[PDB]
Design a protein around this ligand. Structure first.
Ligand SMILES: [K+]
Length: 885
């Protein structure tokens, strides 16, 4: 309401005016007001139809996972552990100022676990989280057994061409195709009840213990602690990085120096973002850790009700085509009638179990989400004569070279559907990591028929959008998108399991099946979200250096030159999904346009919807890539932005521009080498605008065959020296920045000069000079924030023979009273008008109504939140007008 809510700290939210001044007594400790203890903090907030909705989470929360019995996931009741997250609706109880009062409180309870779910959860293993300091070599993992080794075994090599038909690998030209990566070295994989370490291997191909938590606690932890000690000492850092502070910064909870169990980290990370509709409150995880569930809270929920989350494993998405969904599901694990204790997500008929969510928003009563599919594959946990013992089962699903050029054809290509196929291929003198061809060429799951029942294939979840970490050449090409065909127009061959971006628009009824699925007793109930899609989105290949063509470049040897705050250049990331209604009007009879934008590594993604039926935007040609998704690359200025410092994203309906705010105080205190971080000062603002031909503009634009796009611009609003308080996007032409250059708040005004914001030092000084009041002062002789007003002398009446005219006439003739002053604007097109009041039968007084940086007009009677601004404009009485006509 011409007010800007600024989160001052973890508990307080203050209301600000367009003049970058706080409304007196508006500062509210929303934690105290929500009747929550001091361990709670604001995770997210949103306004919905005049009321504020706040998502709160506690630094004290402790969650337990017990493999035995029912109700497996539970808060640890002993001591201060049962501290669930809450969504609170607040209303403004006053008409003069801000007095927030609590309306509704919603508890976000732990998930229900069905019998089938617990069978997967008992041996579920999750990778340690990726930090700012995780290296490409840290993510690299030892290559697994080849296809020949798994199905045929140790004997000979030449018998492949003859024995492939018996193992259902008809015409497979890849006996030496990797079946996955080893879990005896590398990043730590921990059960829900176990804890991740503060140490990250420098070379995951040699250091780390993977899933061997016994070996970690018995011999390797001592080795990591002496090489990479926490600061107080000064260590070597030859084999490991100590990322404790970088973990604390991404929301990892600790007991002194020890991170709490995986299930607690998952819970606390999962209550990070909210979106509100007329009927629901939806809560999703952060873009740092994979989330396995989300909440759909019915706003009609009775006070003190435990609101249950819905599992992603039970939420079936539309991945574009059924083959795209088949690809993901087949690589989740081994599905066999004969299993015994071999339970995985594919085995128990579940779908994709986790995502790294970019964020959530709502346009109309629809929920919008995006995120990357978290890598999830099967692993062999059997112990003893097993070929794949302690090996994750992952493989490249990149399209073969012979595939037809056309989106549908490229993504439905059967290459790597059931098992491994890609690796290394040399056709005459030209090389490729991808098969050149697709009876038929068969693919089979990497488990041999003999050990069908005597194998234990359980489920793992990776920290990144990568399925396969195996230290080979295809992984780098799949991770960075360097697989192209050798055809006329060179087309990028997509993976269907690595770096898979996901998005959609979810209807109130789809949210209702989700709530029903959360509350389901006994067996699992499934939800179907049908207005969703997926897209292969690799990281830019130019965030890496010195890659080999036709010795290959692998993760363990890949040089990162990434400028966006990550030490790795292989794993994709997204942040700040924000929806926005387009202010540009559509042709009559059509519904107002809307879209959403999200930032990923190396560019901005634009999400397109059809407002007529709140569906994804589409085109009749299946060859054309779904026009619901557009990607636009960043230039060097936007790429330089540390994406891990993302503070908030706002949209302004008047301009149709998204403002992504980055705060450098969000950087961890210390390095992976325990060195203090010195560039923790400043902030940055990226502006996103729509580009391209938009739907329903005219009769030709009722159909689209080209995806509307967006453009991110590191638009000149930034500092390396100031501590940000907040950015106020006043208008397309101006933004106000409140920052501390010491301990005291200062106001800076940035002017948009043909697409580029630059500080206006004279405007900043004018707007900051408010004498402790709510608005900039209006000086008689100065061209300040309110321009400069010069009134005519009383002789103006006798000059233009207005003495014959009555006060009533003059007042009811706008063109006349604008000749009573001269207005000098402070900025171009700043307008002013005079407001007249009859003072007597022969005299009137005039007072200016002047436009501020926000484009609105202000006068003597202007208010913000019902509070009179008392700007202090001059008044002028003119006397000598006729009493009667
Ligand atoms: K002035």
């Amino acid at each position: 309401a011409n007010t800007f809510l600024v989160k001052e700290d973890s508990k307080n939210v203050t209301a600000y005016t367009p003049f970058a001044t706080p409304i007196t007594d508006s500062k509210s400790d929303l934690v105290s007001l929500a009747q929550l203890d001091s361990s709670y903090q604001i995770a997210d907030q949103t306004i919905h139809n005049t009321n504020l909705f706040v998502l709160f989470k506690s630094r004290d929360v402790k969650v337990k996972y017990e493999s035995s019995g029912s109700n497996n996931i539970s808060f640890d009741s002993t001591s201060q552990g049962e501290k669930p997250s809450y969504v609170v609706e607040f209303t403004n109880s006053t008409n003069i100022g801000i007095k927030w009062t609590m309306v509704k409180k919603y508890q976000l309870d732990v998930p229900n676990v069905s019998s089938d779910m617990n069978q997967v959860l008992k041996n579920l293993i999750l990778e340690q989280p990726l930090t700012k300091y995780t290296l490409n070599s840290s993510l690299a993992k030892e290559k697994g057994k080849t296809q020949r080794e798994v199905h045929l075994g140790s004997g000979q090599a030449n018998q492949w061409t003859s024995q492939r038909n018996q193992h259902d690998l008809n015409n497979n030209p890849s006996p030496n195709a990797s079946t996955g990566f080893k879990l005896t070295t590398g990043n730590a994989y921990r059960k829900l009840s176990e804890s991740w370490p503060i140490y990250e291997p420098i070379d995951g191909t040699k250091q780390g213990k993977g899933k061997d938590s016994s070996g970690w606690s018995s011999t390797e932890e001592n080795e990591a602690k002496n090489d990479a000690p926490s600061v107080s000492s000064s260590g070597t850092f030859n084999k490991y990085l100590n990322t404790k502070q970088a973990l604390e910064s991404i929301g990892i909870l600790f007991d002194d120096q020890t991170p709490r169990n995986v299930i607690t980290q998952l819970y606390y990370a999962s209550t990070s973002k909210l979106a509100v509709t007329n009927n629901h409150i939806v809560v999703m995880g952060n873009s740092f850790l994979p989330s396995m569930w989300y909440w759909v809270v019915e706003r009609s929920a009775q006070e003190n009700a435990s609101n249950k989350p819905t599992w992603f494993a039970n939420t079936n998405l539309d991945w574009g085509e059924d083959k795209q969904k088949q690809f993901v599901e087949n690589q989740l694990g081994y599905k066999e009638t004969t299993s015994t204790n071999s339970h995985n997500f594919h085995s128990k008929s579940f779908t994709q179990p986790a995502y790294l969510i970019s964020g959530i928003d709502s346009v109309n009563d629809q929920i919008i989400f995006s995120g990357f599919k978290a890598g999830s594959v099967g692993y062999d946990s059997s112990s003893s004569s097993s070929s794949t013992k302690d090996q994750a089962l992952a493989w490249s699903t990149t399209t073969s070279l012979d595939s037809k050029t056309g989106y549908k054809d490229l993504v439905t290509n059967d290459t790597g559907l059931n098992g491994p196929i890609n690796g290394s291929f040399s056709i005459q003198d030209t090389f490729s990591f991808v098969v050149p061809y697709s009876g038929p060429i068969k693919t089979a799951y990497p488990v041999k028929k003999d050990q069908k029942s005597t194998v234990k294939i359980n489920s793992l979840i990776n920290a990144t959008p990568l399925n396969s970490y195996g230290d080979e050449g295809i992984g780098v090409f799949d991770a960075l998108g360097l697989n192209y065909n050798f055809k006329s127009n060179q087309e990028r061959l997509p993976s269907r399991t690595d770096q898979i971006f996901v998005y959609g628009i979810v209807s109130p009824n789809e949210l209702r099946s989700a709530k029903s699925s959360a509350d389901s007793t006994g067996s699992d109930t499934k939800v179907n979200w049908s207005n969703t899609q997926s897209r292969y989105l690799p990281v830019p290949y130019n965030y890496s250096e010195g890659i080999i063509d036709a010795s290959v470049t692998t993760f363990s040897g890949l040089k990162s030159i990434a400028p966006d705050g990550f030490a790795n250049s292989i794993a994709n990331f997204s942040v700040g999904l924000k929806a926005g209604i387009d202010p540009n009007p559509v042709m009559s009879g059509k519904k107002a346009n809307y879209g959403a934008v999200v930032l990923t590594r190396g560019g901005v993604v634009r999400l397109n919807f059809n407002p007529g039926n709140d569906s994804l935007l589409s085109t009749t040609d299946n060859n054309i890539a779904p026009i619901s998704f557009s990607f636009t690359p960043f230039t060097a200025a936007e790429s330089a932005v540390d994406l891990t410092t993302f503070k908030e994203v706002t949209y302004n309906q008047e301009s149709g521009l998204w403002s992504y705010i980055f705060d450098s105080s969000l950087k961890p205190s210390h390095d992976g080498k325990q060195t203090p971080v010195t560039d923790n000062m400043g902030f940055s603002v990226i502006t996103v605008s729509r580009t391209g031909i938009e739907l329903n503009q005219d009769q030709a634009t009722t159909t689209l065959d080209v995806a509307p796009s967006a453009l991110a611009v590191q638009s000149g609003i930034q500092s390396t020296t100031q501590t940000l308080t907040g950015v106020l996007p006043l208008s397309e032409e101006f933004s106000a920045v409140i920052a501390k250059d010491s301990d005291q708040n200062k106001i800076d005004i940035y002017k948009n000069n043909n697409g580029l914001f630059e500080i206006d030092t004279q405007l900043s000084n004018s707007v900051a000079t408010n004498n402790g009041g709510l608005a900039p002062s209006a000086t008689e002789n100065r061209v300040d924030a309110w321009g400069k007003v010069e009134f005519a002398d009383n002789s103006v009446l006798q000059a233009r023979n207005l003495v014959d005219k009555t006060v009533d006439e003059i007042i009811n003739t706008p063109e006349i009273l604008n000749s009573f002053f001269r207005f000098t604007p402070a900025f171009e097109d700043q307008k002013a008008t005079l407001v007249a009041t009859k003072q007597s039968d022969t005299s009137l007084s005039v007072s200016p109504r002047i436009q501020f940086l926000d484009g609105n007009f202000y006068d003597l009677n202007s208010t913000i939140a019902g509070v009179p601004l008392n700007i202090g404009f001059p008044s002028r009485v003119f006397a000598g007008f006729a009493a009667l006509p």
